[PDB]
From a paper:
Our in vitro results demonstrate that compound 9 is a uniquely potent inhibitor of human GARFTase. The most potent analog, 9 (0.17 μM), is a fluorinated thieno compound with the fluorine positioned to make an intramolecular contact with the amide hydrogen of the l-glutamate moiety (as predicted from NMR and molecular docking), thus restricting the side chain. The α-carboxylate of the l-glutamate of 9 is stabilized in the GARFTase active site by contacts with the side chain of Arg871, as well as the backbone amide of Ile898. Compound 9 is 882-fold more inhibitory toward GARFTase than the corresponding des-fluoro 11, indicating the importance of the fluorine for GARFTase inhibition in this structural motif. Compound 9 showed a Ki of 0.17 μM (17-, 25-, and 882-fold more potent than 2, 10, and 11, respectively). Compound 10, a nonfluorinated 3-C bridged thieno compound, is ∼25-fold less active than 9 in GARFTase inhibition and exhibits the same contacts between the l-glutamate and GARFTase as those seen for 9. This implies that fluorination in 9 relative to the closely related nonfluorinated compounds 10 and 11 may bias the conformation prior to binding GARFTase, thereby reducing its entropic penalty upon binding (i.e., leading to increased potency).
Residue numbers in the entry: 808 to 1007
Write the structure that this text describes.
């Protein structure tokens, strides 16, 4: 399965994905890394790994739809089969999501449905939970609302801050996001006709 990773920043999930997909049993190959922000560290990791990179500036297109069109163009250019959002901080248009329905995974740093949205760790700490975690899910139109693929619980420790909580969660992310990719790329998991998660 040919895979694209969309990033916006440091790219440590990208790195975890690269690491698993070079294992010989990997059913995924990362063929392109696409970032909407230049000079971010995820682009270095991708170039250090030998993976082609493209930077699409969302300040050169008029529409969200024109912008995703540019991404889709690159995905088609590289004959991509699966799209992994690994720290992509931009919301995708409805038609783009429709076209990739069932082929696009996202890593979100909470136990969904808790703490949808962009500041999940802040939500978790404000709420006062003693357990949080991360989720890999298919991207549906409603944000952080697609079919869940994997989750891993992570403890919240006393005095945690966003810094320390997200450090702990990210170790879990580097576990379940490569596993989730591998489930989907091997055809073990798909999105069923009924749109629920389909094990095979
Ligand atoms: N349809 C759909 N799309 C998507 S994308 C995704 C990955 C995580 C999204 C995190 C996220 C939560 S809010 C937000 C935001 O407001 N971004 C600004 C750009 C901000 C900037 O660049 O400064 C903007 O999109 O304009 C995000 F980026 C999941 C997902 C999904 O489930 N459904
Ligand atoms: N709402 C989406 C969101 O918060 N994504 C989060 O951004 C980070 C990207 O880190 P990385 O660039 O080191 O992989 C990850 O921690 C992921 O959970």
């Amino acid at each position: 399965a040919r895979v694209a990773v969309l990033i916006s920043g440091t790219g440590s999930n990208l790195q975890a994905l690269i690491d698993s997909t070079r294992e010989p049993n990997s059913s995924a190959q990362i063929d392109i890394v696409i970032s909407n922000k230049a000079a971010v560290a995820g682009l270095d990791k991708a170039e250090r790994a030998g993976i082609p990179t493209r930077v699409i500036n969302h300040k050169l297109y008029k529409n969200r739809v024109e912008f995703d069109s540019a991404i889709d163009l690159v995905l088609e250019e590289f004959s991509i089969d699966i799209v992994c959002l690994a720290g992509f901080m931009r919301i995708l248009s409805g038609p783009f999501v429709q076209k990739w329905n069932g082929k696009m995974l996202n890593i979100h740093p909470s136990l969904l449905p808790s703490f949808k949205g962009s500041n999940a760790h802040e939500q978790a700490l404000e709420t006062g939970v003693t357990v949080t975690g991360c989720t890999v899910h298919f991207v549906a139109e409603d944000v952080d609302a697609g079919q869940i693929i994997l989750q891993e619980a992570v403890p919240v420790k006393r005095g945690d801050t966003v810094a320390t909580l997200s450090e702990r969660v990210k170790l879990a992310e580097h576990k379940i996001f490569p596993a989730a990719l591998q489930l989907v790329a091997s055809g073990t998991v798909q999105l069923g006709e009924n749109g629920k998660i389909c094990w095979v």
